[model samples]
Target: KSNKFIIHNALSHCCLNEPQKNRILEEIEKSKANHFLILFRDSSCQFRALYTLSGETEELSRLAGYGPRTVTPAMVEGIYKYNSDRKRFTQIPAKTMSMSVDAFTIQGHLW
Candidate 1:
């Protein structure tokens, strides 16, 4: 019982702290059991995770084939398509018919 209590406390401490959590996550990513790619569902979020894991904004830019200090819309669009379909190439939705946050945000521009 005491051993469980100690382990629980340690895990809680790690979970509640940003630095510790990031460190632990990095170690887990290194171990091959996990990859940073699995951490986010969207291209934007994936880019953020890449930055968090690598601490290299330029690397993300390079990976996307964008010039220094730049992010192209095509880059994000491609990632969005890839994320939507991981096994094979998938087409991006042609029309914004779905009522989603992204759709909501975009509709505001037309009105």
Candidate 2:
């Protein structure tokens, strides 16, 4: 299935501590998936490759959680691309990542 899941909040504040980075890198090493926009704690420890770099919103929800974040279609922010071998995140223009949208007959995955 195409990605229609909008788990917000990972975009607004995408900073990390040592543990956070370590854990995320660990997962990246393990998984075949590169597109991981992870958000955790007051920090975000998610992993994803936008085809490169990436999060945040200021809206908080006690029910959902504090400091809620999101990545909507209208949300234009930097997306990160993961280099498995180099283990680095390279950011590209947001409009390009949006190309991933409804690629019913379009293209995606970084250019």
Candidate 3:
């Protein structure tokens, strides 16, 4: 998808040194999976992330029913981290909260 293109461009033109690029490329592999969570404040950002993660043109289709919601220059930037030991993608939370089920119905529970 588009994010992959961005990643490729970064690999070619970005100033990252070899070690940094290697680490980033290793991390980028995690985004290929579909099960990771997307947590963002903006719905549009969530859609974009989904497009990148799912590699689908239609956001709704990739999101399936779970919708909603980084920053390193790499695809794995702030949004995700690759656990080398665990060999999996970990969601970096936008915000942490403790709330009742009913609290989820309100936007106040969101980060």
Candidate 4:
């Protein structure tokens, strides 16, 4: 079953406190889900958390307040935090791109 389940965090991770972030992360993690794709965006201007399972399509969508097209790349994969084995966020590497274009606006990318 390849399905990208897009979810929301309700607040921008930029201003969210660590505890808040962790708490929200808990909710997301409890979701009984992987290949988890996420993008952080507050949706009101800042960046919050976005989610998708592992499906593919071409249609405009919205989450929380942040809106990122499925074209965020990697067929639109994003993440936020993790406990021990998983990561706290995403790890993007373009070699030089890592330094220059780490993240993109409109709620799509990790810095």
Best by lDDT: 4
lDDT agreement of model 2 with the native: 0.31
Provide TM-scores for the models.
0.19, 0.30, 0.27, 0.33
Off by over 4 Å in 4: 1-16, 40-46, 56-111
- lDDT: the better of candidates 3 and 4: 4
Among residues 3 or more apart in sequence or in different chains, the pairs in candidate 1 whose N, CA or C atoms overlap within 3 Å are none
Q: Which 10 residues in a row give candidate 3 its minimum summed lDDT?
A: 97-106
Candidate 2, 49-82: lDDT as tens digits? 2211121332111112122243343333344433
Writing each residue's lDDT as its tens digit, candidate 1 over 1-111 gives: 012222123323421246754554454444421112111233333222221112233222221111223332223332222222232223345542221111001111221
Q: Which stretches of candidate 1 lie over 4 Å from their true place?
A: 1-60, 63-69, 74-80, 83-86, 94-111
The better candidate by lDDT, 1 or 4, is 4
Best by TM-score: 4
Tens-digit per-residue lDDT, 30-97, candidate 4: 65533333344422223444443323442223322245434334433322332222313334432321
Instruction: Report every candidate's CA lDDT.
Output: 0.26, 0.31, 0.31, 0.35
Question: Which wins on TM-score, candidate 1 or candidate 3?
Answer: 3
